[PDB]
Symmetry: D2
Subunit: 138 residues, 4 copies
Amino acid sequence: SLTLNTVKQIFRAMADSPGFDRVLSKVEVLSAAPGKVVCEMKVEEQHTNRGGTLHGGMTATLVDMISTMAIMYSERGAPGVSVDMNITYMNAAKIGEDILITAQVLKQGRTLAFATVDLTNKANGKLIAQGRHTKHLG
Amino acid sequence: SLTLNTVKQIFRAMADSPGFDRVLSKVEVLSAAPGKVVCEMKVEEQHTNRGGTLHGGMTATLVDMISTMAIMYSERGAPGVSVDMNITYMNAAKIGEDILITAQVLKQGRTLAFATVDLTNKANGKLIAQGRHTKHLG
Amino acid sequence: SLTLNTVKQIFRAMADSPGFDRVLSKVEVLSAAPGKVVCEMKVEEQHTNRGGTLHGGMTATLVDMISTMAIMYSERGAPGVSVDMNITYMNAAKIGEDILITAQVLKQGRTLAFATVDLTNKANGKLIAQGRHTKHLG
Amino acid sequence: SLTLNTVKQIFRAMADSPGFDRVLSKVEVLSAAPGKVVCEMKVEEQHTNRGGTLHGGMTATLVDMISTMAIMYSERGAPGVSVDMNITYMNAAKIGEDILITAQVLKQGRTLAFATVDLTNKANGKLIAQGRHTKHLG
């Protein structure tokens, strides 16, 4: 399995982009194992909605990308293309709060991959949001 | 009902922000009626994933925000807070392609609002993605 | 290809199954064409939860099966296997109420099919529920 | 408060209803505590689609009802009304197979409750389906 430094470099390369992935530049990788990736982020103004809490679209981007990372850490190593994503929002995350983003692969099929993602407050473990992501690998 | 110019100014004010809503700065409002908002956007590099197609997180942000706009255009005028969002991805949108984002309110309840959003290719009407968004108004 | 009368025959044979599809025996097919099927049902005690309203599980079964019928009414004729289903519940349907279930295919791809389903109160057109169903054809 | 034996009694009374809940008559309750209920069922012909596997509608009913039981097992004791349900289907469950249905409440709010549900093959622990259910308590 890969060293944390390797995964961090891969992630940093992904985020150092003119594309939309740039919005994840503040995200840090804490751990990576086959089918499981844990990231951390401090919620800053750039990540927030009008009310100054973590934007639903930022949460969605996190779910999308961190689950993709976990799906990729597999025998096949294919990222796949998004088919379905759902997110349920349960607690607000305010500016300054540290969040954990935990993505777990539920199944790697012949053509489909499925993953779940929890966003939690790092300090007290409070559940911010949970998402599920289905991707087509072919 | 409000003039298009008024809605455009409100939207522009929303997007001219240090917050995450900044990612929608290229979006133009085409029409607004109670419970229904149509926006347009040209897909540029900043909106894309690694493959150079519209990023799933950008689509999610569009669904979130355009549905919020339609929910707000109501007797109550409350934006609400996200509870559940789902997106199904059906066709890729490439760089240079013009997209329509159409949000329709399905129901305004006493405490909950529900809206659907279609993303389509403006030129041929091809369905890019469809999302549904449930918000808590209280 | 299928015809309305052939789809009607299925809802007699699919519904007098010993299998779970038996729960749809009271459903009448009103209309069918490639990619779209419309059914009607009167809500009866057998369809209800303990609160006297249409059971969420019955709604899910309706979404599942009627979308499957619309997907199968195609040149390929594949019914597919379920991948993702989501349902948003907006208005209760009470005993005695006549409901319309309307399934429209959004895309038939090489390996995936996508359909939306509306359940409406027949008498006033109000939305009871809306579902989306993604199926794997490969 | 509820107890396991009381939840068991409900699955005898809820299940010998003339209503839709009758479809869960073969379900056995193994475990219950505030916010979590675990059930077991052997897949039988009555639970299947025309392909001899666990019907998606039966799965949805299981997700709906067992999550409702977990939500009701709380200090408030509100069963709630369904708002959103989503299910991802990952592995077929065949006739004769014993399945576990595990519902865990994620959050009980002032007006909303959120629960996740796993269906697993009892013999190997493989994930059949995973659902999320949001209910309104107000």
